[PDB]
Design a protein around this nucleic acid. Sequence first.
RNA 1: AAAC
Lengths: 429, 434
Amino acid sequence: RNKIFISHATPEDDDFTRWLSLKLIGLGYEVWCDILFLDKFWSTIEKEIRENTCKFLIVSSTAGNKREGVLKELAVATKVKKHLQDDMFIIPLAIDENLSYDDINIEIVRLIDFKKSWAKGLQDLLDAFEKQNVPKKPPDHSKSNLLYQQIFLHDKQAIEKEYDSNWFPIISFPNELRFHRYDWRLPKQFDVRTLAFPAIRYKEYLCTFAWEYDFIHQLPKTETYNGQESIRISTSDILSGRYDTDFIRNYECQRLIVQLINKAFELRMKDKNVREYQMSKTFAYWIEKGKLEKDKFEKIKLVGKQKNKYWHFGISAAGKLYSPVLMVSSHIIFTMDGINLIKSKSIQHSSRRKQGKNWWNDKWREKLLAFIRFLSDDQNAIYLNVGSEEKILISNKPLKFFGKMSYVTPSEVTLEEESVLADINNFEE
Amino acid sequence: ELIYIEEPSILFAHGQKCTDPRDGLALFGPLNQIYGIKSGVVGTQKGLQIFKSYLDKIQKPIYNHNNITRPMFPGFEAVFGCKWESQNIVFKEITTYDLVTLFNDKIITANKNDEERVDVWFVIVPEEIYKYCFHDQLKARLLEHTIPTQILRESTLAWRDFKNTFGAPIRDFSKIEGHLAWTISTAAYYKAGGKPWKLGDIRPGVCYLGLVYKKIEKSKNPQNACCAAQMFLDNGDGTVFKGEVGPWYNPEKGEYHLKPKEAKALLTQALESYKEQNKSYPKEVFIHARTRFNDEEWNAFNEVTPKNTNLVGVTITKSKPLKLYKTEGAFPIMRGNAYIVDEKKAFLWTLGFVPKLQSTLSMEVPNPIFIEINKGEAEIQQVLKDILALTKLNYNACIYADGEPVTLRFANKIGEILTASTEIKTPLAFKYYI
RNA sequence: AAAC
Ligand SMILES: [Mg+2]
């Protein structure tokens, strides 16, 4: 009547069938193809060919040459062609180059090719359609787009269904931030980084969370300390922003707390039984081979093997106070026999970019969380030493986020395709 | 509490809004159609035959090992609607400074002597040249003449023929040969005056600006840094303005900033280009950079900007990781989810899993771009939508979307090109850099 | 110097 029926090999020729079908509904044709519906059937298919279909096409490819479905479509279409005495009711669409002559279905060899290019084939098909009195509507690509979204993007949408960060909250802070002042200026060669406790040389003051007696036995004997000139600020209003003096401003308060937290973490990783690594910016902190139980912790691996190198899942940390949290960045640092670091950083980066593949959301999340739990003091907290009595408490469970949209979790074999193909591609890179 | 932004829809031909540029290109075709592609070839005779073989391959459809994440290549004429033959190929035989010198000499002599104009030029680089040395230098030297050029190697189109001592190919395209042809064809169509796609859900009269800074190592002054800007409306076809070479980089601070005597110049260039291309002044202007601007730059920007324009400055950073993890599954957080830190700071997940591809743009875990409205006043969700849209307009690669918005993606490459030649002054579209 |  008016429809344009396409028959094809469903699994192997769905690319060309998709392309041709969508292009044909784009041009206003009333196209009928087996892939243009969801939750479909032979009673309906045969009904369209017998009465509704005005033109019928087959995809003459090697894969679809001998297919029960397409052959039975060809049979019913031959019946309709005999009924309608149309010399070109059924039209081959040869898209396969390997399909040699005298190998096509006998009902087809005696009768448009896409082997050279689908554009040339589509033009030939369009002029063949125009030569016959093929009914059509004005070109409406809007309905073609609607069909593309409704059929081919139905499983590729986003659910309205209701995330573990690397941002670990700081539930409690030491109540006061203290600046120490001494009668004599500390020597310039005296490095505050060598101080056993976090301390920032701010102006002539020393910025700490700590007390005076913590470093009483490491400061030079030529320095005399006075307890009167130390100034304390209430930390709760430091976060609340209510603090305002000319000596120190809130924007500097939070930044000072940031480097205090960073140094506290760096010093804590000396008593946390963790080895160190030199990178461009900061200290990487990894777990040595031979220390962790079978290189696992709560049944998450943290250390492993890569060719003759050994990878160790290390971390670095950085505080922030906008909500007070700490971010942990995950690095992978290699050693050559589990003990000796690789001298040259180029192999380190190349090996890291090789190793990062095969690791995805759950693996990265579990490895970072395992390292954090390994760094915890309490079950649900991490204690950073800032003072002999003052401690910084950072919850070892990262921040939780209430989402509202997500995807239908697809087959993991698709992600395995991603893993293998992208792994090969990055090897090429 | 995350928020989600519906993925930006981009137009293609026939006024149809799709989401994947490859899907729209294969469905509706390019938004702006060109009658054809006239291609120019410069290289050795073996390079010529390799290029001819690769067009013979391009004419026929090429398939990917995964046709959902990387949709198949219908064939150039099937998707684009314009032919790229071997008869439209003009070849000039060739039998670090000297090599690019000969190549540029051939290109200029061809562009001058040949009567018939050529839409794009394609340069075949032998493997020895790649191993012993070019793209930035050559493509910069051709900036004066406004010659859109695409560079390919001998081992890129004929990778199967080139094999190592073990007999394996140097680099394997078997699984993504269709994707490689997709990208090459999209680049060639972009450089031929055709605009493959443009954003659809976008407000009228909005411009997006991106500043780029590149240091000069050969300069005696260690502080020197050239500047540049990139401008996009919604087309993704951006105009690039070269800045001034001089003391830009802040060495102790590690930042890049403009004195007010060049920020005015750059933004005035951007606004005059807008007025030429639109005949009106934009209602909003967004400036993008990897670093926050000092108040000097912002005031210099504000003086040259008209009163009715709500100038906004937004910085995009790959800062310290807020790497979200979905609780269940190895599938990362989907691309397009945003965290509203505050009305001026937000996180945008331009990478990660996308339902349309059932795949991930990011490799390991999507590191979000921290976007900050450091200057100006604008609604944060609108800025996130604009950056999400701008992530789609990378014409140099035929991919679903880009991790970095196009206003900042090619910062390093355009900087390398601009600083490759120091004695060259340039007015130009993005197609003369990518 | 297909490309991120
Ligand atoms: Mg390019």
